[PDB]
Design a binder for this molecule. Structure first.
Ligand SMILES: CCc1ccc(NS(=O)(=O)O)cc1
Ligand SMILES: [Cl-]
Length: 280
């Protein structure tokens, strides 16, 4: 079972059924997803030479779907290709860059022709480090390996910040930083992330020639996976007679471990779809 498409006119009642008896059926469904993709190895990520390149020793890309750097395991980064609604390498998902891997991160961005980066963690959350600050921070410039990055602009809004960089190897990169998503949790409202996703999707659509969209949080699984699932399902709502949350999360899990990492995130995806449909 790899799919559970729900007619739009039936979604409200479907989600109610899932929610009944303290989420009995929802939990059952989410538990199934936890077995998806589990037959796959992560041998490369486990090589001694790569140990320092992983933020979490237990969050590693599958060998089958990892992103390779050009060029020993100088080819290694903790990142995975993820299909979307539209094509098979629609996203690259990655961990929050480390001080010692941010040059690798930018090399990947360059080599993969990335124009858009989505960041859904803060660098520090409740005093715990989640992500290195890996960009130049005030209209200035810094080297990252063989590349130079320069900030062109920064627009701060209450729930996200959008930055534009030039990268020289001069491509323009947009960086979409959602700043109000607690780790292992969900945003305070469906409205907030729905708007953020629609905004990013608008920019993606306006990015002719772009490679994959990079999406990351801290581990590159929970908040990242929820973002991608919501991006996919919102497109389904706009273009199709049905919506397949289970199928989206299934497909994510085939490609990287733990995608959509808590049950409350899975619930939140349903609440988002329910709220969009109520408004429509
Ligand atoms: C314990 C490793 C771990 C840390 C953080 C997360 N959440 S996140 O993927 O949303 O950053 C998931 C897993
Ligand atoms: Cl890799």
């Amino acid at each position: 079972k790899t799919s559970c498409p729900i007619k739009i006119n039936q979604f409200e009642g479907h989600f109610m059924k899932l929610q009944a008896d303290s989420n009995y059926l929802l939990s059952k469904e989410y538990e199934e997803l936890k077995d998806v993709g589990r037959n796959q190895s992560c041998d490369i990520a486990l090589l001694p030479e790569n140990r320092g390149k992983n933020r979490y020793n237990n969050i590693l890309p599958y060998d089958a779907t990892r992103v390779k750097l050009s060029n020993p395991c100088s080819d290694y980064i903790n990142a995975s290709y993820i299909p979307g609604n539209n094509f098979r390498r629609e996203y690259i998902v990655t961990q929050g860059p480390l001080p010692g891997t941010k040059d690798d991160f930018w090399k990947m961005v360059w080599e993969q022709n990335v124009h858009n980066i989505v960041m859904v963690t803060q660098c520090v959350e409740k005093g715990r480090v989640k992500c290195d600050h890996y960009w130049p921070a005030d209209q200035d410039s810094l080297y990252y390996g063989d590349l130079i990055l320069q900030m062109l602009s920064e627009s701060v809004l209450p729930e996200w910040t959008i930055r534009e960089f030039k990268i020289c190897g001069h491509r323009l990169i947009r960086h979409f930083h959602y700043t109000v998503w607690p780790d292992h949790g969900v945003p305070e409202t469906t409205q907030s992330l729905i708007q953020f996703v629609r905004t990013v999707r608008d920019y993606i659509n306006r990015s002719p020639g772009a490679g994959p969209t990079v999406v990351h949080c801290s581990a590159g699984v929970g908040r990242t996976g929820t973002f991608i699932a919501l991006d996919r399902i919102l497109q389904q709502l706009d273009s199709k007679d049905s919506v397949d949350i289970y199928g989206a999360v299934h497909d994510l899990r085939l490609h990287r471990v733990h995608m959509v990492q808590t049950e409350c995130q899975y619930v939140y995806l349903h609440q988002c779809v329910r709220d969009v449909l109520r408004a429509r």
